[PDB]
Structure formats: structure tokens, C-alpha cells
Amino acid sequence: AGPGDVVVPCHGEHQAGIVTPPPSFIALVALDLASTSDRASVERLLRVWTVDIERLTTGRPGLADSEPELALVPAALTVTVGFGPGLLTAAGLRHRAPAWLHPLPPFGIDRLDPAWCDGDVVLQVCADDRTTLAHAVRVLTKEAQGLASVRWVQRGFRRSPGISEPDGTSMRNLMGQVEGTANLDPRTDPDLLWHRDGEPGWLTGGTSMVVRRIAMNLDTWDELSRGAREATIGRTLRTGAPLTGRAEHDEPDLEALDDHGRPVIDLEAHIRRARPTQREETFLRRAYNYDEAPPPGRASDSGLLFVTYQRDVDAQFTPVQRRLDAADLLNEWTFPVGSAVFAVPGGWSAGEYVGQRLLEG
Amino acid sequence: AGPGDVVVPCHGEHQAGIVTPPPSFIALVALDLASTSDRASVERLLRVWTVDIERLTTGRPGLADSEPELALVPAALTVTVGFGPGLLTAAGLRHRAPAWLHPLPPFGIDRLDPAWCDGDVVLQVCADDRTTLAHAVRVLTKEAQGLASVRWVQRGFRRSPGISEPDGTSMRNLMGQVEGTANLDPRTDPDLLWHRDGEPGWLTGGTSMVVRRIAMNLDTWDELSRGAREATIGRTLRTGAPLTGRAEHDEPDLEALDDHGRPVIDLEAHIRRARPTQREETFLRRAYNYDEAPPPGRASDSGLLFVTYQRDVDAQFTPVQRRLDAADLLNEWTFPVGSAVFAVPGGWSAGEYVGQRLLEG
Ligand code: HEM
Ligand code: HEM
């Protein structure tokens, strides 16, 4: 009857937690395989995780679960499994690596901290309840004991269940902006998200995942007028409308000039520079806010858990990231501190296990 | 109407966020005053914070608030202000310090990390939404820039709004236990929470606040059977009933023996050792779960944000803490890593400011 009772099916053509409507909370858990790891280790790990995913997501305790009462409220729990290149190396499956399974190239804007970078495998754990999420993470982490150890955990949030943004907007970030308006529609453009026919065959129903941890300099952001902040993005903070429109969902008019013949939306405005240049230069953004205990001598450690899904990182994401590196006003108040690329297996049915089509050989 | 629309009044005989039903999220922000601080600094700080509290809690932007749209959803926001000894020192008011305003005495069980200890002032910021909380914390922190800097921030959680525990229980902690059953009732025993007539006069309507950051060794806790975990506390994990009863709210029978003449609830069981020995040896527990990104070698960094409120720390809390130090089975799987004591001013009305009765002189 309430948001705690919601079960999201973990079985299908695709893994859940990608086109699944984003719930309130996320923990991205990157793990590194043990030095002893081989194909058999990786297989066992994926198989024990499959059991725990099928149980936890239906509000049943996991296999390595000593706190069953912490499992009984599923709260729309999803776990999405992604493989880093090191997993394929350790399994002896380099020959099955897609061309795009590698770190993003370096960019001038990068301030990458290796402790927020890479990972042999990732669990994107999402739920509408923080206790449910804490439990799921504890169970999945324990299950991997001796097979993989935690490399990093990035925690993020949106509004709570039953709490919609001011004026029913998509998501508010900690810069105070509306985020998610002009996203990839996987109902119209499924071929730009989902791997179908191509090589390698094990990625059928699967995708690629990018995680950029992008810090917001809120201290310098505070030095900008409202007008300068809106010019930076090309959309208003109140409604989330383009500078040229009245409502959130109005099409930005990138041809529109002011009385002096200057573009209304700046030549270096985020949404101009980030816009698709070709059909394929788009991706499913599925971002979350992060807000940490601040470091010595600062008020805040806030930013964006920028998670994107696309068929091919190199063809779809990287050309956009490369265009923003070259020019984007937003780069003056944001900086990437973490980068990770993962291959996401397709879904599975009762009796299968996640990544099975890969570990066949 | 939804949980986002809820306004908790910040005006009354007492500060809100103490007897206010606990909402989903908490951030305790400890700040340290600058060395150059004086009575005028402290007064200004409390006055600018009073404005921000009155605004943010009613879903209006703060004074130093450049992200107003992040303020529009109050989500039951409360801010509770506590003063550490250093605030009274800095204001030239040591002579107004109650006898109990000092760090707790040291205990054998203490593993206190100075970075989680003390603070000249604390903001307990509570809300049913994490974006609302992140915003409030950002506004209050910015407002103190040049008067006080952040010392630590402890973040915690319960279940999300509209999400109740399995079988309508009080709160589940990350040991999987029911927490909050045998708490101080301030409706029956208000004199054990609230300072009324006594010296010092400025604490009328006020209280004392203890924050213990208590780490859970979940790795060693996992080595215990269900029976051993229940024996440790003296209550069952499923229902939260005493070992001697059937339901959560049954009175524990501490005289009850098994067929072998052993006490049914262990002599060193948490709820036996923690029970009041005298009427005054009780306090309002208002605890939250903490779950951090784990340190390099470990699966989890989980524990309890143990926040308590009482008229007098020395008379009420410390004798209980001292009895648990002497013997408690739970001490084998928990350890305190942070300790802070604060004096909590009484409430205020439209046109007053928090702590005004102190800064009079
Ligand atoms: C802190 C970092 C960032 C912030 C605060 C941010 C914020 C925003 C905002 C406010 C919008 C407009 C609303 C929307 O359509 O979602 C937007 C759009 C977009 N952003 Fe970002 N963004 C950030 C980083 C990135 C990065 C690194 C990329 C890299 C590819 C990216 C790609 C996009 C794209 C493609 C759009 C849609 C543009 C359109 O077609 O109108 N963003 N972002
Ligand atoms: C991680 C640390 C701790 C855990 C997991 C924990 C857990 C619990 C649990 C499960 C209960 C039984 C349910 C209830 O009545 O609340 C309880 C009761 C209690 N705890 Fe703790 N506790 C911890 C630390 C402390 C500390 C440091 C104190 C310090 C004074 C304390 C004081 C109490 C009191 C007074 C009760 C009620 C006892 C009664 O009258 O039946 N606890 N705690």
C-alpha cells in the first residue's frame, strides 16, 4: 500500500535499475577481484550475487544474511551489475571485451582522484529507503568476501518517496538547477541504449555505464548572480525553462538573438555544448546528488554522481565529454574527481545468473 | 498533502527537534568559534541563524540563500542549537555554565577519535528529505563563515517517510535490532528532560544533549547465533519482546529464572545494565543509523548516532554510561569513537533569538 511494499522485477530482457524510474537513493559499490581470481571465482561471485539480488529485491533475506528483518521492506530495491576490463582479464576473456571497455581518455578539465576511478566490477544499488539500501550493500559485500573487496562506494540522493520537486520538475541538483529535462527516450530510441545484434554477442540486452563523480564549487558558484548562473546552463532556475521559452519542456531556441545580435543562449552554454550533434551523441543520464562531510577548512563537499547508460561509450558519451572539455561555461564551477567505465550484461530469467553469456567462454 | 508540505513550528516553550517525532534524516554539524570571537560575534551568529531557522523550517529561503528553490519543501525540517563550553568561554560567560557542561569522564570502553569529539556549538538538522537537509546545512554553514568553522558533520537515517518498520516497530538499527522501546516519556516525566526553575536561569525550557558516535563491529557480530545476539540485549530480534515476554511492549521480568536457575535475561544483558537504578537515571534517546563509505580494508563502517537529551548529564546519563562501562555483553561488538556534550537553550517566540537568555550577560 506504500512505497516500502514496491517490488521492481529483477528478471527481464534487461537488468533493472537502468530504465526503472529512479528511486530516492543510490550506492555505487566498485569492487576489485582477489589476486587469486580466475573464471571459476568470477562465475561463483556472479551466481551467489544473483541469488541475493533475486531475494533482497522481493523482500526476502539474502544467502549470507544474518539480519533478515532488515530485508523485509524491499522499497523498489534494484541492483545493476557492471564489469570493468579487469574482470574480463581475470576470467581470461579479454577476447570478449568490447572496443569501448577502457577508461575515458584524459581531458584538460579532469581533476581525477584514483580512489574514485575504475573498478573490476560495480553494483549500482538503488532503493526508496536508506536502511533497505544499507542492508543490501552489507549482504552483497559480505557475499563477495574472498572473491572481491570494496574499492570505493559513492552514495547519492534525490527527494524522498511521496516528495515531488517544486512545480513537479524532474530532479533538483545542489547547484539549485533542474536536471534530467532533455534526456534519451529509450521507448523511442532503444538502439541508442541497448546492445542487440552486434559483436560481442554476450552483451545482448546489455549496455555500457559511465560514472563521473563531478564536484560543484558552491563557494565560487555563490559569487554569480542568478542571471550569470542561468546563462551558464541556458535554462532558468525557477521553472527550468530555456532562456528563450516559458516552461520546462519548451524546445530551446539556439538560433534566437537579442536586440544586439548576440545569441540568447550563450555559444558556450552547457545545453548548447552538450546537445546531440549526431543522432547517436546522446545517453540515458541517471544522476544523483552527493553531499559529504566537508574536508578540513571548507563548508561543503557537494556534487553530482553523474551516471550515464549508452550502447557504446566511444561513439555516444566520449564525443559529448570531448566537446564540453573544449568549451563549457559550467567547467568554471564543476570539475570531475572520479571516472569509471563498465560493460553491463543483459537481463536474465529464473534459473539463469547475471553475466552468464560472458562466462560461458 | 504529502510529507514534503509538513511544517514543524520552530517557536515554543522548547526548541523543536527534541520531543518532535524523529523524521527520516539527521545531520549534526559541530562548529568551532574563531579565536577572535567575543560576546558580540556569538550573539550575531545566533541572530542570523534564528532568521535562517525561522525561514527554512517554513519553506522560505534563508538570508544567505542563493538556491531558494532548494528551500521551498520544508519536509518537517527542525534545527536544534546546542552550546559547548567553548561558546560560553568565548562569550565571557563561564560563570553561566551549568556544572554538567564538560566532556563525559573517560571510560575503559572509549576509543574516542578527537575528530568526532567536542565542538563549541552544534546544529542538529533533521528532515524527511535529504535535499532539504543538504540545503539547510549549506545555508546555516555559510551564515557562520568568519564567526565559526565546521569541526565535524555526522549524518544518519531511519526509514523514509511513509515507510514503517516490519510489524510497526519503533526503529531498526544496523545490528538488525529494535531500538527505542523503553524510552523516557516526556509527557509523564517532563522534569527529567526539561530544565525549569534551577540555576542557571538561562536554561529554562532547555536541556542537555549527548552525542556518542558508537561503531558496530558487524564482522564479529556476524559470528553470533540469533540466540547469542538476543541474549546480548535481553530482547528478541523478530518481535523486539523481552526473552521473558511475547510482545515488544511487555515489561522485562528480570527476576525470571530458567529450569537450571540461571537468569532468563543475562546479568550483563544490555537492557538489565542500562535500566534505571533510580528515577533520574533515564534520558530521551533519539538515535539514528550511520553507514559510511568504508575505510580501505573493510566491508562496512556502520554504527549508531547515539543522541540523548536529559535535564542533567552528570545525574542522568553518566551513571548509566558508567554502569555499561563496568559490564555489558554489547561492549564486545560496539565501541564509542566520538563524544560531545552540549547545553540546549529553551525555545523562543516571534522577535526573540535562540540563546538570548544566555547572551543577556
Ligand atoms: C556538475 C556537473 C553538471 C551539471 C550541474 C549539469 C547540469 C545540467 C543541467 C542543469 C542540464 C539542463 C537540464 C537537462 O536537460 O537535464 C543539463 C543537460 C545536459 N547535460 Fe549536464 N550537467 C553536468 C555535467 C554533465 C556532463 C559531464 C555531461 C557529459 C556528457 C553532461 C551532459 C548533459 C547533456 C547531454 C544535457 C542535455 C542537453 C540538451 O540536449 O538540452 N552534463 N546538465
Ligand atoms: C551501538 C550501541 C548501542 C546499541 C546497538 C543499543 C541498542 C539497544 C537496544 C536494542 C535496546 C533495547 C530496545 C530499547 O528498549 O531501546 C536498547 C535499550 C537501551 N539502551 Fe541501548 N544501545 C546502544 C548503546 C547505548 C548506550 C551507550 C547507552 C548509554 C546510556 C544506552 C542506553 C540504553 C537504555 C537506557 C535502554 C533502555 C533499557 C530499558 O530500560 O529497558 N544504549 N539499546
Residue numbers in the entry:
A (entry chain B), B (entry chain A): 23 to 383
Quote the study that presented this structure, word for word.
DyP-type peroxidases (DyPs) are heme-containing enzymes known for their ability to degrade dyes through their peroxidase activity. Based on sequence features, the family of DyPs can be dissected into four subfamilies (class A, B, C, and D DyPs), according to the Peroxibase classification. In this paper we identify another type A DyP from the alkaliphilic cellulomonad, Cellulomonas bogoriensis (CboDyP). Except for typical class A sequence features such as a Tat-signal sequence and the presence of a conserved His to interact with the iron in the heme cofactor, the CboDyP sequence has an aberrant sequence in the region where normally a GXXDG motif is found.
The crystal structure of C. bogoriensis dye-decolorizing peroxidase (CboDyp) was determined to 2.4 Å resolution. The model contains eight protein molecules in the asymmetric unit (molecules A–H). Like other enzymes of this class, CboDyp is a homodimer. The monomer has a characteristic Dyp-type peroxidase fold containing two domains with both a ferredoxin-like fold, consisting of two four-stranded antiparallel β-sheets packed against each other. The porphyrin ring of the heme cofactor is buried in a hydrophobic pocket packed between the β-strands of the N-terminal domain and two α-helices. The heme cofactor is ligated by the strictly conserved proximal His292 with a distance of 2.1 Å between Nε of the imidazole ring and the heme iron. A glutamate residue at that position is different from all other DyP peroxidases so far known which all contain an aspartate. The extra methyl group positions the oxygens of the carboxylate group at 4.5 and 4.8 Å from the Fe of the cofactor. Hence the dimensions of the distal cavity near the heme-Fe have been reduced.
